Amino acid sequence: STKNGRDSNPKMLGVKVYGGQTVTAGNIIVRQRGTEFHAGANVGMGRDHTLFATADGVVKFEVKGQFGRRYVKVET
Amino acid sequence: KTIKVTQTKSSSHRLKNHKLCLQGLGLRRIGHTVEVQDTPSNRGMINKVYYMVSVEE
RNA sequence: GCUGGCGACCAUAGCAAGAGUGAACCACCUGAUCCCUUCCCGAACUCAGAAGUGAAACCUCUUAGCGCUGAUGGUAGUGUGGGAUUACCCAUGUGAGAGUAAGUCAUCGCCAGCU
RNA sequence: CGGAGGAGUACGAAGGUGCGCUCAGCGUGGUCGGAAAUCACGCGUAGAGUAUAAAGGCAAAAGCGCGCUUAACUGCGAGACCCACAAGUCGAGCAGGUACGAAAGUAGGUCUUAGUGAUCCGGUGGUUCUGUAUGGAAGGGCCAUCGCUCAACGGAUAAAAGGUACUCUGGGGAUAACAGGCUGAUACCGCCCAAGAGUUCAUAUCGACGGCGGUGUUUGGCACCUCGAUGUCGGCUCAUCUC
RNA sequence: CCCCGAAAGCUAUUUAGGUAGCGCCUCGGACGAAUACCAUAGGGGGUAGAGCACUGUUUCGGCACCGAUGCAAACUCCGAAUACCUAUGAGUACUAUCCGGGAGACAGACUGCGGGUGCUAACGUCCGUAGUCAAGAGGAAAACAAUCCAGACCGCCAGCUAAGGCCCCAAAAUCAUAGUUAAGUGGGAAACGAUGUGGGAAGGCAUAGACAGCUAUAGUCGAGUCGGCCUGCGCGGAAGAUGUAACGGGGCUAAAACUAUGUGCCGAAGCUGCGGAUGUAUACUUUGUAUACGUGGUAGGGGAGCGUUCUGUAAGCCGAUGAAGGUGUGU
RNA sequence: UAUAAUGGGUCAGCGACUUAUAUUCAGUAGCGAGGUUAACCGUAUAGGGGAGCCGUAGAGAAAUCGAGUCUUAAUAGGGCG
């Protein structure tokens, strides 16, 4: 008899809106367990590290800063 | 400015996108020949199914 | 042409070693009266000041020393069609990683002082 | 019925806010004191820590202290994620009342993802709802909350173990025991290399450590045929083929 | 008789060969480019490969470190091709979406590619992805659901081709040009063994005389010889039970075998030709007419019909100059 | 599945999606902001019989309001119309 045989339910993480798409305020952009992407301009962060848009515009990804962090922002 | 395409093999067992490329060029059966505009958009469909068409350029 | 502040950028821009700067600015610097301060200490924070020094520190300059960047060519992988089954070959499209040649001791913007 | 680990909790501070601080390692010296207690100074460096398993993260530190406090609030909520349903997740912003800051401001529990149980039936608090002639009341409704290892965790009842060779019916070759089939781990047979044994001499005859095949006599693996029946362990009689 | 046409999945279930919601089919209504194929532009990734910067593991040196050197599903300093999301655009196509009526199905199979398990066993088992069967006929593979070619409306004693073939069974080349094989290899199988033969790149010695043999390095003779590497096709290794039985058979050796090239032909229910039928759509601005695209089908859904008995129409019409029924013939 | 899986020796005759009620959808006919009677009476498929049913208005648990209503301190926001 094996001592294995368990696993957890899926969580459906990942990027929901890619670069170049238009969003409205409140749209969820990234679902993530940790902070792989950071919040840029017009982007807010939830209590579970979810990134969402706070204004209408176009999504844009970039790499910025002295630590080389990945940022996502919304251009109005 | 226009080119002639002839279907030379069957399309029954091919991939779905290959069948759709044939339908988008307008070929309907073996031996069918059509005349289409010479544009990159048409050339892409032709190049995808190169192996079962003949082009009179 | 120097000094200070605030940004763009985040190593071709960083570390390391060596050398300079006191007119102004900055830095150490004097003591602790009032404001304020340390689970103790005027060491840090703070106030009241210029008798000393550019020693340290911060800046600027030089160096390929460490680091970083990096081709061209080839190789591996791979979508579609065909031929084979120890995982290859042909046609067509695509194309790394490592390594080699080589490069680098940054580049810009706003304001205020001194010549 | 693949390979590995965790959960059925904890905390009125381990929550909020303002201000402040950086780990771990090694090396020198310094009483007991040393491998390793505390003190001081250096070197290189995230390898420390995050209540708890791992993963994704963590400098405006999300790590570590101090003062004051209760936003671990009420009414909501544009817009999204996920999804058979029932459920689950994120959320700017608006109104009221607060806490901490000089202030711009931050706060609708804790770095996040586990710490859970539908409906029915009852219990407790409140209520400008209803009240079987009428006025009350009993009972019911609405809002808040309590009683599940219902753990077979979408939970058949408030309440439940066994025997049948004395057996019976509806079905299945959807599924086992015999024989057939596929396979060849195992079994048997053959070959390659050759330490050595053989008074000397690998190969007269054996042959260690290793390697490559053949057959379909063994023990097995699979479940393709047969369950509206292919009905046998050995003996007797009679055989036929292989090398 | 005509038209369309699935599934054997997900979730839950005292559930596992039952059922329910969703996914897949069909019919009606609304509404038309909002859809798809391809091109261009924007975007995130951590797989193949690779590497040792972390976590582990590995060999040899020097003194845990230093220099070389390997490995990894639960390692990553790196990192594709494809897939996926969005926007714009030409051309082609009854595409997409919404609201309702009716379902079936929830036992799948094989083959290729990427994998877990198993022995890198099984026509084994469990996933992802594509094709075929299921529900699909025709030609080829001797026979052979799942392989290759190809999607059957009906008729023809017409033509062209696909896979595969052209000595006879049995349709078409005893075709053409160069080579290889002697094993019936072709037409079953390994490690290993061997002067079998064809081709290629080098090397050693040699007419002051090379190899072999022979006389005691010299010597008689008279040109090549010697040992390796790469490569094409062959040989041994090779034993089974009813009957040759491991080319389908006959038979085949300057092939009727293998390699390369070329010119013709055969070959399907594919395509074309002639005649006929039918579904949908667009125009004739009734038409039943032309054009265009279609017509393989299980479970299912939709449409249109033929016959049988009885009631009205029927106190009608047919009937002993012969009804119903039975048995032939023609159409 | 030719299957060595099931059923049928053969012929003739018989043999399996119905009936009643309720409900929903689609065709078709009458009337139409209206439509329609049931039991019953009736020398009776006529004619009477309007009790009742469906449609015409939602919101809210309900009292209550009503083109609005519920939640709320809120005329804010939001849900159903």
Domain-wise residue ranges, chain B: 1-56
User: Which are the contacts of B21, defined by CB distance < 8 A and separation ≥ 6?
Assistant: B45, B48, B49
Distance B47 CA to D100 C1' (A): 70
The tokens for A4 are 């294995």
Q: Is the CB of B12 under 7 A from strand E?
A: yes
Cα gap B55→B38, rounded to integer Å: 12
What are the counts of helices (DSSP H) followed by strands (DSSP E) for chain B?
2, 3
Q: Are the beta carbons of A55 and A45 closer than 8 angstroms?
A: no
The tokens for B27 are 């070929």
The angle subtended at Cα B54 by Cα B50 and Cα B57, nearest 5°, is 105
Resolution in A: 2.3
The angle subtended at Cα A46 by Cα A44 and Cα A48, nearest 5°, is 145
Cα gap A33→A15, rounded to integer Å: 12
User: Which are the contacts of A68, defined by CB distance < 8 A and separation ≥ 6?
Assistant: none
The tokens for A72 are 């996502």
Cα gap A26→A55, rounded to integer Å: 8
Give, as ranges, the nucleotides of chain E with any atom within 7 Å of a protein CB: 36-45, 85-87, 89-93, 130-132, 149-151, 270-272, 293-294
* b (16+ CB within 10 A) / e for B9-28: eebeebeeebeebbeebebe
DSSP-derived letter for residue B20 is H
Distance B30 CA to F34 C1' (A): 66
Instruction: Indicate which technique resolved this structure.
Output: cryo-EM
Task: Name the residue with tokens 């395409």.
Answer: B5
